[PDB]
Design a protein around this ligand. Structure first.
Ligand code: VDP
Lengths: 237, 9
């Protein structure tokens, strides 16, 4: 509710609007989706690679992030990219058919698109439930962009050098979220909302750990790793 | 050793 806190919220909202296209116009640039085992890999690999760029673009605008060292910025983005991707995907996720609907039937993704290969259901079943539970929080867009930023600036990520500064930046955002809920999220929706949002960050860590397991299996098959992008291999590697 | 990500930064 402070002038500084409103400043943070305005920056994070504009940063999100600059890095998330609700028209999904750029999806034409991706390799084409095909729906028959790994038929969707080239299209979805380009989707993830595109989204990593947008997550980095959002991360740059977070107040205090640029004040970090270059190496802490890389550690934070490497460990959080897939978590922010899962978070930011909730905007396109719909509970009608439990799918990410990005504007066209070709750009609608369900469990069968992603969970037919290997053990990928061990990630997709918990991921859909996370999407369902996150949607049922009905967050304000202000709260959506704060949670993404809090997720990125995490002091406990492995390999963080300066950790006190990461904590100071995250607490600035965390105190902005808690004060926002009290001041503009009315009851009953705001009941326990901050604690439920923090719990979603814990769900993301287990989804992150499961994603790491499936990527390692996917990447060890060179024929499948050929289908990825250079940025995905660099970040998820 | 992360040229593309550091360039995006
Ligand atoms: C990222 C976003 C979006 C993400 C949408 C989804 C729904 C579909 C599945 C997505 C893309 C997830 C990925 C597939 C995770 C993928 C990505 C990858 C390669 O990093 C990986 O190891 N994954 C899990 C292993 C599955 C391998 C596989 C791929 C294709 C086919 C069969 C098997 C992560 C985020 C998910 C949609 C939209 O809101 C834009 C937003 O930016």
């Amino acid at each position: 509710l402070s002038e500084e806190q409103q400043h943070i919220i305005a920056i994070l909202l504009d940063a999100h609007h600059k890095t998330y296209d609700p028209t999904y116009a750029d999806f034409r640039d991706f390799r084409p989706p095909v729906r028959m085992p790994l038929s969707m890999l080239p299209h979805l690999a380009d989707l993830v690679s595109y989204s990593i760029q947008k997550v980095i673009g959002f991360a740059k605008m977070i107040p205090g992030f640029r004040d970090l060292t270059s190496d802490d910025q890389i550690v934070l983005l490497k460990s959080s990219a897939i978590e922010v991707i899962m978070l930011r995907s909730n905007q396109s996720f719909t509970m009608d058919d439990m799918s990410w609907d990005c504007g066209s039937q070709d750009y609608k993704y369900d469990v069968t698109d992603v969970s037919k290969a290997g053990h990928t259901l061990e990630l997709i079943e918990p991921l859909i439930k996370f999407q369902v539970g996150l949607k049922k929080l009905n967050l304000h867009e202000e709260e959506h962009v704060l949670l993404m930023a809090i997720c990125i600036v995490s002091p406990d990520r492995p390999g963080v050098q300066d950790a006190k500064l990461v904590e100071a930046i995250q607490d600035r955002l965390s105190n902005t979220l808690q004060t926002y809920i009290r001041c503009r999220h009315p009851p009953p929706g705001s009941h326990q909302l901050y604690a439920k949002m923090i719990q979603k960050l814990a769900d993301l860590r287990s989804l992150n750990e499961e994603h790491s397991k499936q990527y390692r299996s996917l990447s060890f098959q060179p024929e499948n790793s050929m289908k990825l992008t250079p940025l995905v291999l660099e970040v998820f590697g | 050793n992360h040229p593309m990500l550091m360039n995006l930064l």
